[PDB]
Design a protein around this nucleic acid. Structure first.
Ligand SMILES: Nc1ncnc2c1ncn2[C@@H]1O[C@H](COP(=O)(O)OP(=O)(O)OP(=O)(O)O)[C@@H](O)[C@H]1O
Ligand SMILES: Nc1ncnc2c1ncn2[C@@H]1O[C@H](COP(=O)(O)OP(=O)(O)OP(=O)(O)O)[C@@H](O)[C@H]1O
Ligand SMILES: [Zn+2]
Ligand SMILES: [Zn+2]
Lengths: 675, 675
RNA sequence: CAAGCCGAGGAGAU
RNA sequence: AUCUCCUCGGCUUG
RNA sequence: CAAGCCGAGGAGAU
RNA sequence: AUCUCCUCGGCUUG
């Protein structure tokens, strides 16, 4: 039943017989079907060869593993051989080492295999070796980078390959090495200005992947051009001339607070440099133990980010963010007072006094939003799907709120939903993988006609067809832009970019376009190179990478060696008071820290407002949570909100992290808490 | 919205229609607005001409490019056309060749364009040609000199122009050449005594720029005289009669050390000739391999420079400099001994024994500083900005320390800060471009009322208004003086010069004044000349310059031809011992050198005190650093601290430089370091 | 469904 | 090399 | 933020 | 033509 096409033959013909190589075709070129066909051919050759045929497929994203399991690999290969799809979300509840030798076909994230090999080296588990495999297939090869996961696996493979070469000169016996295949569309450039450097980056990629070729289509390219239609390019610009009243009022309060705290701005307002200066002032205040330097800095930061989003988000969202922050602060203050400095009262009373007028001033008119609405609605009328790319998740939420609230979209009847990434990213609600999964399914079937997504959807997150692809103030790198452009896969596509004229964004878009042109100019060059000098370059890059990794591991071992028991005193950053000693702390689960002595309980204050409570200091500085672990409600504390004081010279140092502290703490002896 | 003035029309009228010319107006005459208006007119003519309009602007300084991008060009031209500002600091991260044909307006440093053209000639990159442009504009035309960057570009242009002329006689087709405009205020004189030679220099400038005219204002000159007010000239002199005690003690130790090392001074003390003699003795000691000749010479040099600054700097700074130098020497000696000649002990013990008495003798009183303070404070009281020009950066630092420490300035409340140049200049901390940028911004907005700067601020570094301009022992050339004088741009200005009466400095100031007078006397002359003989002179100078450049390139190619693999033996200059062979050395990044054999590791000693360590010899002579490159911590060595010994005739030669050695070294073969 | 931990990648400013 | 901002994967607990 | 490399310009003395 | 002292730009590495 398997079906194929000419360009697929031409690209995949070399790999049919050895030739561990890479393949670079645009999106929607059937690369997945190429891969399944190649795997089938390899397994057939093994069977007719009376040799063990093992195939492993590696994908950076978890979803794509199940996607290939459901759509391409299993349907076209179910009957001939045994197949399985692994992932972190999925329970590989047997084990990796033997399922490698139980199904002959593995589809798993690279991290699982990497963990298995590390376990083997540690000797804790029997583990697995690459020799057990006969064919490795890697999707999204462009991620093979300085020390990415793919790069780690390939560095192990290349060390084995160098050992085998050395033996070939020394001893005939050698460890067999499985074939390697790579799939990609935009290999990318490591920020190379000279085309020579771009080719150097391409050769580095090839050496990491041991491809020895690229094998891009050259004969039937016309057929691909006919089948694939590139979206029409559209540029959109804007200027922030309006917004004068409320911006002016906010800047007036800005200047007032600054002069009150006498902060030299050392930079222009509304920029990342100012935030960095604010953080430097935070650190200085920590090293000095004074107030009036950090609360003001955080408030300035909140105002700055509010202003930044205002240029790209409606003022209502910024006002709500600020109000929520101040309400949380006031709840903190009320709790601390309930248990029972002038600048804090100044800030809160300033905001309270001007709260009503600020609300009235923000509610009034005086935007990219109006023109975005114009473009989207006129396009929808002309069409009778849609994707938005932005910077931060709350921007996606604001866009969803805007499209729901406005009645014009309801008149059009366009369906929309907000999609974002997972995990915790500094005050953005983590999103569950399953939730993203039903969102993508709902969009796939048709109910959602508009999908708002962050960089996650830029890569992978494959869809059959997306008619409209519009980016909104998001330009990062050539790979992101090109993959977003190719994600349309529609017969007729509209690629739009929206941003501010003052900001350097259109320049970035054209830079990515030139990077694509340069990628072609370099890929065609490398495809035409002398085999001897070529292989020489691959060897040089391989050996250099292996050596660099070896020195890096040596310096990682040599960097962390102190591990002293107790040589410090931990204080509260906000109020320089002795909070804990260097030994009273105890470790649990080899990851968390806690203080158990009741003397510590007599210092801090417990607070809960909302299923684990949080801790606060006498000065209102948040410390941690009340972890419920194996019965015990242990008070876990975050070093992110503390200060250190060594026993000698008292050099104050803030780490925002535990491992960055070279000295280790003792584990929790439950026997110390008997009765 | 664009606005203009009559003299601007009169000067710029000829350029409106061809007439590749130059313009010479004083500072703050709106030359920038003249340039933007001319560019706008040219682009409009191209548009109505249905022809491609390309404009490129060249500036020697990096900052001025962004300055024109922010203040003059973009604000007045944003809407009509597309604009961009390039620089080394800025990432032209697309490429030069196509951004030339992407925005129609380029503002970049000349070096970038020069590099692009050299790349084109080499054929490595597609590159760019001047034909792609339609109008070239050059600021600071006075820098078009013997083989400056502007001169290189103009020499290429003039070779093309001569080819086009030859074809015009031979073949009608010819490569079109963009118009050329030059902007300046003080074209300058190439040290001409006869007014005929001054006019010759002016004609050389014009020929390099192909100006064919000067077009200085002659009609509305009265209006410029009214609008611009020249600063009042002030001379100040001083004598070093005082300072007898500590100077006498220093000269006593001077004589003691000299007699101990029996050095014929061959010159007077406290002069550059003595330093040159000391360096000659250094070289002789290198050619003989003896001690007691270089350490003493360096100590004498340090004493000499200390004395020189004492005439213009407080003794505390000189004492601190000497103490730091000797502490560094002693740390070196302690390290070398830690691993485990009588004159060195003599020097160190002499300084140690007299250290306390020297400190006590320097602390006592017995200066230009007191009168400088008097003048500055009385002027500040009279005024109810300020700029200081000096020789060396540490002088600026000393001035900042003096103004901060003294309480009288605090009573006045004058704000001050030290500004200096960037880069490494033999034991002066390099300064970052961004740092200079925020310094200039802070002064511009008002917080800094006093800006101490070196020759960098003399040229460019434009400021709206600088009330006070005072120079402190700095007279170099007529251009520096005139530009510093015009940099005031204040309605009322005070130009002051301070220096020693004995030194020949007031003479230099009046020489620069006469040079300005002579520049006018020659510019008015050249503006009135016969067109035929004029063009003849321009042609003669152009052809002469092109021919000279051609012979220079021929002799540069013919000079470096040996490039032998290994014919020498490298020894330590201080101790004549075999340090390395002619082949054991290896090259990396095509710029650095290193020795990898452990036998070399068994010879030198590693030292680190402070993120790269340094190397020292068994005799305490510093050699290089431990470069951390692409993983490897390769030991990089500086030929500046070594001696050479050829395999024949053993002629010792010190180069202070690698390229000056005609023989080349092999690159680093990483394969030689496997495992 | 929530919390925590470990590593990695990309962009922007020093 | 440092700081900031975003994103991915793996592990643990409830 | 630090280090290194390449060229160029100016001043002073032989 | 040589030596010394200052300044500019470009490139690379971390
Ligand atoms: N040989 C083929 N004949 C017909 N259609 C094909 C063939 N190969 C692939 N396709 C089309 O490919 C579409 C799926 O594209 P697919 O996901 O395989 O592309 P891709 O290049 O792997 O994508 P991406 O770059 O997003 O990972 C299917 O709708 C099918 O129509
Ligand atoms: N046509 C004009 N009308 C009014 N003011 C003008 C005009 N042209 C220039 N100016 C004044 O010029 C000042 C800026 O001077 P500018 O930097 O252009 O001088 P410049 O001659 O280029 O300087 P420099 O010699 O330092 O490079 C502005 O403050 C503006 O007041
Ligand atoms: Zn506290
Ligand atoms: Zn030595």
């Amino acid at each position: 039943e398997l079906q194929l096409r000419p360009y697929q033959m031409e690209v995949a013909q070399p790999a049919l017989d050895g030739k561990n190589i890479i393949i670079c075709l645009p999106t929607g070129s059937g690369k997945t079907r190429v891969a399944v066909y190649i795997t089938k051919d390899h397994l057939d050759k093994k069977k007719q060869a009376s040799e063990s045929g093992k195939v492993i497929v590696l994908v950076n994203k978890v979803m794509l593993a199940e996607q290939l399991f459901r759509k391409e690999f299993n349907p076209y290969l179910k009957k001939w051989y045994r197949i399985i799809g692994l992932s972190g979300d999925t329970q590989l509840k047997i084990s990796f080492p033997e399922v490698v030798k139980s199904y002959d076909v593995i589809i798993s994230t690279a991290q699982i295999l990497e963990n298995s090999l590390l376990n083997l080296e540690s000797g804790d588990d029997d583990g697995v070796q690459l020799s057990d495999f006969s064919l490795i297939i890697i999707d999204e090869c462009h991620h093979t980078n300085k020390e990415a996961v793919y790069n780690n696996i390939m560095r192990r493979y290349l060390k084995q390959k160098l050992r085998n070469n050395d033996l070939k000169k020394q001893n005939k016996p050698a460890i067999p090495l499985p074939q390697i295949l790579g799939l990609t569309a935009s290999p990318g450039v490591g920020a190379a200005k000279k085309q020579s450097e771009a080719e150097k980056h391409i050769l580095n990629i090839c050496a990491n992947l041991d491809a020895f070729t690229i094998k891009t289509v050259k004969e039937n390219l016309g057929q691909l051009k006919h089948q694939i239609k590139e979206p029409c390019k559209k540029f959109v610009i804007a200027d922030d001339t309006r917004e004068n009243p409320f911006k002016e009022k906010l800047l007036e309060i800005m200047a007032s607070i600054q002069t009150y705290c006498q902060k030299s701005p050392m930079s222009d307002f509304g920029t990342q440099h100012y935030e960095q200066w604010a953080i430097q002032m935070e650190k200085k205040a920590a090293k000095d133990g004074n107030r009036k330097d950090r609360v003001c800095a955080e408030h300035l930061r909140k105002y700055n980010e509010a202003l930044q989003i205002n240029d790209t988000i409606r003022m209502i969202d910024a006002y709500s963010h600020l109000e929520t922050f101040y309400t949380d602060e006031k709840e903190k203050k009320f709790a601390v007072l309930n248990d029972s400095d002038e600048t804090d009262e100044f800030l809160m009373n300033l905001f309270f006094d001007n709260k009503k007028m600020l609300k009235k001033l923000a509610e009034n008119p005086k935007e990219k939003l109006i023109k975005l609405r114009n473009t989207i609605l006129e396009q929808f009328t002309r069409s009778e799907r849609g994707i938005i790319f932005t910077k931060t998740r709350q921007s996606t939420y604001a866009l969803s709120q805007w499209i729901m609230e406005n009645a014009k979209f309801a008149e059009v009847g366009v369906k929309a939903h907000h999609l974002i990434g997972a995990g915790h990213s500094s005050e953005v609600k983590p999103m569950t993988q399953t939730e993203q999964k039903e969102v993508i399914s709902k969009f796939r079937t048709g109910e959602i006609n508009l999908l708002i997504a962050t960089t996650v959807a830029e890569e992978g997150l494959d869809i059959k067809e997306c008619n409209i692809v519009i980016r909104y103030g998001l330009v990062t790198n050539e790979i992101a832009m090109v993959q977003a452009r190719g994600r349309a896969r529609a017969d007729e596509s509209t690629y739009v970019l929206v941003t501010s004229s003052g900001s350097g964004v259109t320049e970035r878009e054209i830079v990515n376009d030139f990077r694509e042109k340069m990628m072609y100019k370099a890929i065609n060059r490398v495809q035409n190179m002398k085999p001897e000098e070529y292989a020489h370059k691959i060897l040089e890059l391989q050996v250099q990478s292996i050596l660099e990794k070896k020195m890096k591991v040596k310096r990682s071992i040599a960097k962390q060696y102190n591990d002293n028991p107790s040589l410090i005193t931990l204080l509260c950053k906000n109020c320089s008071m002795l909070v804990c000693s260097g030994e009273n702390i105890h470790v649990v689960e080899k990851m968390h820290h806690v203080n158990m002595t009741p003397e510590f309980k007599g210092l801090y204050i417990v607070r809960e407002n909302k299923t684990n409570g949080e801790i606060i200091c006498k000065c209102g500085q948040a410390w941690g949570t009340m972890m419920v672990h194996k019965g015990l409600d242990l008070p876990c504390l975050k070093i992110r909100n503390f200060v250190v004081n060594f026993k000698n010279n008292s050099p104050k140092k803030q780490y925002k992290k535990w491992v960055e502290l070279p000295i280790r703490f003792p584990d929790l002896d439950y026997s110390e808490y008997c009765l």
